[PDB]
Paper text:
The T4 bacteriophage [name] helicase and gp61 primase assemble into a primosome to couple DNA unwinding with RNA primer synthesis for DNA replication. The domain architecture of the [name] helicase resembles the bacterial DnaB helicase13,14 with an NTD and a RecA-like CTD that are connected by a linking helix (LH). The gp61 primase is composed of an N-terminal ZBD and a C-terminal RPD that are linked by an 18-residue flexible loop. Here we report a series of cryo-EM structures of T4 primosome assembly intermediates.
From step 2, we derived two 3D maps of the [name] helicase hexamer bound to the ssDNA template. One map (map 2-I at 3.5 Å resolution) showed the ssDNA template in the helicase central channel, but the helicase hexamer remained in the right-handed open spiral form. The second state of primosome assembly is represented by map 2-I at 3.5 Å resolution and map 3-I at 2.9 Å, each with the ssDNA template bound in the central channel but with the [name] helicase remaining an open spiral. Initial binding of the ssDNA caused only minor changes to the open spiral structure making it slightly more compact with a narrower gap and less mobility in subunits A and F. These minimal conformational changes indicate that the DNA-free [name] helicase is competent for loading onto ssDNA, although a gp59 helicase loader protein is necessary for efficient helicase loading in vivo. In the open spiral [name] helicase, the ssDNA binds to five (subunits B-F) of the six helicase subunits and coils inside the right-handed C-tier spiral, as compared to the activated helicase ring in which the sixth subunit (subunit A) now joins the other five subunits to coordinate the ssDNA phosphate backbone. Therefore, the 10 nt of the ssDNA stabilized in the inactive open spiral is increased to a total of 12 nt stabilized in the active closed ring [name] helicase. Interestingly, ssDNA binding in the helicase central channel does not immediately induce gate closure, suggesting that the ssDNA-bound open spiral is a metastable state and that there is an energy barrier between the open spiral and the gate-closed, active ring configuration. Therefore, the [name] helicase in the active closed-ring form, but not the inactive open-spiral form, can recruit a primase.
Numbering used by the authors:
A (entry chain D), B (entry chain C): 1 to 432
C (entry chain E): 261 to 346
D (entry chain B): 1 to 87
DNA sequence: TTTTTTTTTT
């Protein structure tokens, strides 16, 4: 049914718009269909417009086809006449035909490779790849996109925009009321959020608390620890969930009976996600390793996270440059860009913590210029919180959170607010 | 690798238990391998235990097939030896072989289906799958892999994590009341512990004292001196262990009789550990050099250290920054990260020392900002003790210790505590 | 009601919003996007607005063959060349 | 004496202890010996242990090698055996 | 070899 495909490519515009990128010369035939599709594709890539019948004829005249190909293309172009068909049905049939033809090409290549490899080494040909590259061509036949989004037309796509507005398909709510009220319903899907604070003042504590809350809200959470082992972060999360004090696990003040009892009482709830903690060596993992980790989790453990928390994002590799090849600014900006690209690609909320230069350690006020590792991070950041803590504030068992950078709302409404962080329990609560 | 797989299935149990389920009768061959695996699977089904060579022989005897196949399988069970290869390599190569054989079977089925399709409809078998069934089997070719430990799940790994809780895994006691009290059972294997003090305050004294304390408690210590020679470090260890003042060691007050007697007395103590001292030129020690000499000499001296000490962290050499760099911050941070990574890879407590800034030499208190030569070190350090010295405390033979940073406990609970120092004895004592 | 009221106006143009991965887009990628908007739709922009220039990737430098003042300036020159060309 | 060197690398543990870290790929020849030591290097860098004969000629030795050099490599692997003498 | 950057220290 290639003739219908070509006729609707030429005479229809919505049809051409819907499925251009999945049209390839290897999908029709070795005869007139491929030739006329080559004509169409040449005109398209040359003039950036759907050719008309006159344009196709003109391209035919100044071509290098023999008599047989000329006659076939001329007849096929003559047959091209517009007909009324269902748009969705046409799209579905195009998907079916493209899938079937890709599978046919794949299996033909498989036959060729297997048959030639069966031959003795002298009889076989080196022009054709060995059996080793069977799976890739086997998996490329199943990796056809079939969906292409060119842009968000402001006037033509206001229905979907309003559906996203009312449905809040982007916001991911917190468990703290103050965070929701300052972020207008939580953090969005493809975003990078930052906790800015000094050394040993509650960065990883805050990230573990956020991970615990997300896990409580039925979310698949992937905690990527860079400074402490898997058991340490899992112990912090255990202290947060089971309400066991962190000192108690060390001192053995909790019996295995009660620990297992509350573990069971947590595991029975259906409002509980899956948490996978994956520590990497300090400065030894990159965004490509993160993507491979996601792929392996999905394939083996059937795990696709919705929240990915990376504690101390700074100690990574940019995956584009050699490690320590550049200065701190360049490599950190590249790592942050890769992290936000991963967040937008997987539509996963990405939380992290930022180091602060010595000029703001033990200081009651923290600004965005006080960030240490780079200035390419705050530009790439969608939300930053200062987690300041002075001696007096630490005495009162609280931290001063400052909204130094907010893209979800105005950062001058509730700029200062106190948070009741419980240092022992690795969890913070709202003062209200 | 049919022979290896069959052998380690018959003999090994860890290999058998790790991957029994990912084994199909059609993975092996059309000849003797399939028959032997059929016999193994039949024996496992009849009796839920791994068979033995005699069991395979008798099962072959009571089996019935062609005499040529009988001889082939009998010869096949004549070569299955123990051959204890590595288990990780075993499972990895078995996974590779299984994936290759699954790919071969899928390819063969695809060829058969395509050949059946390219036939007149009269001469076709309806039992054969249609062309449309080809894609899904391709997924069955790609969706084959052994389950592997990807991350640390917080729920379905809680029992092992509790095992790591009740067992004080990754803990090394200190033989000192305040140290074990503040670290909640010693430092953890694969961490960074640092002493920050001014110039000539007792950093090397402290490291030697810790090395001796570990040596008493049956610990192997890899001392790496960057400033002092091996003889000097051995002398400091002697002064700490034998309670001989540094004056008496080089003034001749120590006699060979007493020295020999005390040495043999410590030799008879089976609780005594093993200590070595490797010296490197100032700024000429590398992480790769750490592993090399230990690797070959580990075979040569059967010595593996629980505690690795690197004197004067600030004057080491990086294994990633190839050329010398004037930037203190980047180089020192990279060196600290390299040290922490080496410690975690070897799973051994790493101790070091650090230099305070020029402004902290005359100060009675030391802050974390007053560190020198970098700010990446306080970020990479799991534990930091400031050895504060002042004239009044020096007169009282006491040095203040202030836990600047602690990931083992709360650094505000016992932040400041006096520790008695015997500089002549080069020893640490706890004030009661 | 407001959307349809704006659509009723004959003085209203067209707005196309396209998001690119941070670092993934390029001046040649921008040109390909313009060609795609001319092909798929009848859209030929008169105003092009980019949130930030330096995020993009140079079409001539491979990845980071040189420093910041060889890629950022190259992208700026490529974007001005795009403006002149279109 | 590359054959003796590789034989004692594979079979003698004490020899591997004092001689392997000072060994390199380009220290034997450009023929089969280089390929054999490359296989050994890959195995040791992948598992931190000396490969067995089976781990060498079965798991490896099935890489992208031409027949002329693959035959030589398998011949070299065949002629490997321990030699009793002092370390 | 020009640049841009974060940084420690006189
Ligand atoms: N194991 C622990 N037991 C008890 N309290 C702890 C423990 N670890 C940390 N704390 C407390 O939590 C505070 C912050 O700890 P962290 O979670 O490491 O915050 P941090 O800022 O990420 O630390 P770094 O190493 O600078 S990133 C410390 O100052 C202690 O008061
Ligand atoms: N051989 C020695 N004899 C007597 N006292 C010594 C000796 N070595 C060090 N000390 C004393 O021990 C204290 C500092 O010793 P060390 O630990 O060697 O110095 P440090 O902490 O390593 O600082 P550095 O490395 O010299 S900048 C001072 O009070 C010295 O007087
Ligand atoms: Mg922390
Ligand atoms: Mg000293």
């Amino acid at each position: 049914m290639v003739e219908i495909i070509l006729s609707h490519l030429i005479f229809d515009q919505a049809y051409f718009s819907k499925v251009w990128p999945y049209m390839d010369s290897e999908y029709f035939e070795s005869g007139p269909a491929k030739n006329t599709f080559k004509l169409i594709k040449s005109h398209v890539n040359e003039y950036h417009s759907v050719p008309s019948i006159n344009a196709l004829n003109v391209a035919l005249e100044n071509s290098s086809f023999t008599e047989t190909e000329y006659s076939g293309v001329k007849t096929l172009i003559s047959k091209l006449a517009d007909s009324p068909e269902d748009h969705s049905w046409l799209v579905k049939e195009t998907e079916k035909y493209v899938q079937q033809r890709a599978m046919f090409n794949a299996t033909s290549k498989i036959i060729e490779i297997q048959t030639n490899a069966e031959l003795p080494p002298e009889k076989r040909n080196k022009k054709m790849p060995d059996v080793g590259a069977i799976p890739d061509i086997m998996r490329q036949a199943l990796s056809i996109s079939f969906d292409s989004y060119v842009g968000h037309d402001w006037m033509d796509d206001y229905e979907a925009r309003w559906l996203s507005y009312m449905n809040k398909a982007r916001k991911v709510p917190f468990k703290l009321r103050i965070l929701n009220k300052i972020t207008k319903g939580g953090a969005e899907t493809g975003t990078l959020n930052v906790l800015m604070a000094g050394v040993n003042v509650g960065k990883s504590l805050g990230l573990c608390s956020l991970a615990a809350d997300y896990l409580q809200l039925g979310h698949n959470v992937l905690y990527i620890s860079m400074e402490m082992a898997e058991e340490v972060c899992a112990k912090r999360i255990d202290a947060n969930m089971l309400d066991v004090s962190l000192d108690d696990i060390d001192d053995g003040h909790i019996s295995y009976a009660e620990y297992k009892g509350k573990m069971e009482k947590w595991r029975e709830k259906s409002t509980l996600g899956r948490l996978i903690v994956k520590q990497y060596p300090t400065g030894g993992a990159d965004a490509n390793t993160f993507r491979s980790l996601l792929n392996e989790l999905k394939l083996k453990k059937n795990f696709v996270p919705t929240i990915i928390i990376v504690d101390y994002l700074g100690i990574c590799k940019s995956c584009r440059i050699r490690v320590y090849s550049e200065n701190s600014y360049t490599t950190v900006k590249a790592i942050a860009e890769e992290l936000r690209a991963l967040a937008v690609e997987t539509e996963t909320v990405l939380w992290t913590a930022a180091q602060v230069g010595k000029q703001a350690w033990d200081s009651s006020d923290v600004n965005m210029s006080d960030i240490a590792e780079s200035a390419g991070l705050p530009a790439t950041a969608d939300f930053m919180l200062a987690v300041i803590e002075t001696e007096e504030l630490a005495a009162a068992e609280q931290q001063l959170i400052k909204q130094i950078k907010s893209r979800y709302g105005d950062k001058n409404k509730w700029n200062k607010f106190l948070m009741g962080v419980q240092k022992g329990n690795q969890k913070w609560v709202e003062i209200e």
